[PDB]
Amino acid sequence: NDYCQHFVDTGHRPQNFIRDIRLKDELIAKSNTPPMYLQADIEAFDIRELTPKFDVILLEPPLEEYYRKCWTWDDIMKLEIDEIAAPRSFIFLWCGSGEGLDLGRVCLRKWGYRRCEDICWIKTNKNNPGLDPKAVFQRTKEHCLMGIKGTVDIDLIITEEPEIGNIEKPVEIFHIIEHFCLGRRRLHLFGRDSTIRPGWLTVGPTLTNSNYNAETYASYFSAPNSYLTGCTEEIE
Amino acid sequence: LFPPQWICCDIRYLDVSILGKFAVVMADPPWDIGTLTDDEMRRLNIPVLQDDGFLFLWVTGRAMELGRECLNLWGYERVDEIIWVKTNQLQRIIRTHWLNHGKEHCLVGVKGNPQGFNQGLDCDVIVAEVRSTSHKPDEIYGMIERLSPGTRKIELFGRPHNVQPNWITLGNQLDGIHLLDPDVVARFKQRYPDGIISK
Ligand SMILES: C[S@@+](CC[C@H](N)C(=O)[O-])C[C@H]1O[C@@H](n2cnc3c(N)ncnc32)[C@H](O)[C@@H]1O
Numbered sequence: 088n089d090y091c092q093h094f095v096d097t098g099h100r101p102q103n104f105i106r107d108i109r110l111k112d113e114l115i116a117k118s119n120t121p122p123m124y125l126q127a128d129i130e131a132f133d134i135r136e137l138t139p140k141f142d143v144i145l146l147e148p149p150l151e152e153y154y155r156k157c158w159t160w161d162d163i164m165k166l167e168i169d170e171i172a173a174p175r176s177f178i179f180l181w182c183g184s185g186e187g188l189d190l191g192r193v194c195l196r197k198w199g200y201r202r203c204e205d206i207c208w209i210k211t212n213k214n215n216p217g218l219d220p221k222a223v224f225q226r227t228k229e230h231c232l233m234g235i236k237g238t239v240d241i242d243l244i245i246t247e248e249p250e251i252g253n254i255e256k257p258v259e260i261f262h263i264i265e266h267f268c269l270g271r272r273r274l275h276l277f278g279r280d281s282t283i284r285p286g287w288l289t290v291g292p293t294l295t296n297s298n299y300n301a302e303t304y305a306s307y308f309s310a311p312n313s314y315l316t317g318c319t320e321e322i323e
Numbered sequence: 324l325f326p327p328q329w330i331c332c333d334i335r336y337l338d339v340s341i342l343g344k345f346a347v348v349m350a351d352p353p354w355d356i357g358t359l360t361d362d363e364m365r366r367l368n369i370p371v372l373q374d375d376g377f378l379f380l381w382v383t384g385r386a387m388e389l390g391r392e393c394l395n396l397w398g399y400e401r402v403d404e405i406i407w408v409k410t411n412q413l414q415r416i417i418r419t420h421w422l423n424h425g426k427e428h429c430l431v432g433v434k435g436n437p438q439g440f441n442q443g444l445d446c447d448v449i450v451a452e453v454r455s456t457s458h459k460p461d462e463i464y465g466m467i468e469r470l471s472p473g474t475r476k477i478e479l480f481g482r483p484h485n486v487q488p489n490w491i492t493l494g495n496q497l498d499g500i501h502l503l504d505p506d507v508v509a510r511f512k513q514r515y516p517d518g519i520i521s522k
């Protein structure tokens with residue numbers, strides 16, 4: 088049973104044939120900060136205004152390849168992410184499926200991280216069996232690189248390919264990030280109204296509303312709560 | 324020499340210029356994470372093996388970065404990345420430091436301007452059963468054959484179960500030297516008249 092040959096023969100991707108903690112989700116939900124969000128044109132906005140320094144940054148720049156205001160890797164690499172990352176902290180960078188797999192690694196090192204995981208979003212086409220001139224193969228997945236700075240999940244997300252023009256990434260990436268218990272200052276750059284989530288600060292150009300206030304946000308992490316992991320009980 | 328051919332050797336010392344040029348190179352190196360140092364990997368004379376074609380380079384761990392370096396140093400641009408989702412016999416993912424790992428990666432590099440390859444026939448995900456330690460899926464040979472049918476290919480760091488028609492396999496666990504291509508036989512005898520491949 089060669090699923091590659093089968094894909095050539097039928098258009099069903101091999102991943103179509105893969106056959107597919109409450110308390111911890113409970114503790115994450117209890118310790119989550121209120122959702123906070125800010126509309127900001129990130130190309131024209133001084134990200135140093137985003138304080139305090141973050142434990143986790145999820146970075147989801149809108150790449151050209153997602154469509155086929157887009158961000159090039161030139162634009163992305165010039166973001167000053169190191170200026171808002173805590174000395175011990177983590178990054179999750181959606182890199183797409185082309186040159187981003189290389190340039191996203193350059194970005195991680197530029198901002199002072201080392202890659203510790205490569206998370207693959209594998210897209211099935213069970214509902215619709217059936218580009219880049221350089222491409223050797225049909226591209227059926229995207230990569231989210233995990234980087235670390237300072238001192239039960241798997242590295243695969245499998246879902247059906249979204250309808251065309253839908254650029255959302257699987258919400259499962261948030262589950263993976265939150266299960267690591269990395270801290271409570273969580274930033275999602277280039278999030279949207281649709282991705283706002285408890286426990287996260289979302290910043291992006293298309294947000295319709297804002298509620299972010301730097302002083303209010305910082306008060307969520309003032310003592311005795313400065314070092315919580317996001318997976319333990321609230322302090323009385 | 325359509326049938327399988329192979330050379331038991333230390334790939335650090337073999338003069339690979341005797342093997343001619345190949346449409347596809349595939350390597351599964353023993354990255355230093357019986358291994359090769361990073362410098363030994365960088366120094367491999369990959370550049371003589373191809374004028375125009377593709378390189379398939381298996382990587383894990385920090386070789387995801389070292390492999391990219393090598394690929395570029397050797398003169399390739401990375402243009403695709405195959406992932407092998409590792410399953411058991413019932414098509415369930417085998418779960419093996421932050422995350423369990425369900426896959427291995429194979430970088431796809433291009434050199435020159437390959438013409439007449441059937442790009443886009445296969446997709447970049449392999450779903451295939453795990454076998455013994457480090458045994459890569461045979462599916463990749465079919466993908467490469469459909470990509471480049473009937474052309475000559477070379478595999479580095481292969482084991483006996485890797486030998487295939489249209490391939491020359493190099494590695495130190497192979498059994499002797501089995502060469503049938505008369506051009507390669509001639510050049511091998513000229514370079515290694517006493518059959519010995521030393522430093
Ligand atoms: C990762 S395993 C290759 C696995 C193979 N692709 C498979 O599917 O089974 C690496 C191989 O390189 C071989 N090797 C290590 N050092 C070598 C050297 N200096 N020269 C040639 N082969 C070497 C090892 O014996 C081992 O068989």
Ligand SMILES: [Mg+2]
Nearest residue numbers: 497498499500
């Ligand atoms: Mg024998």
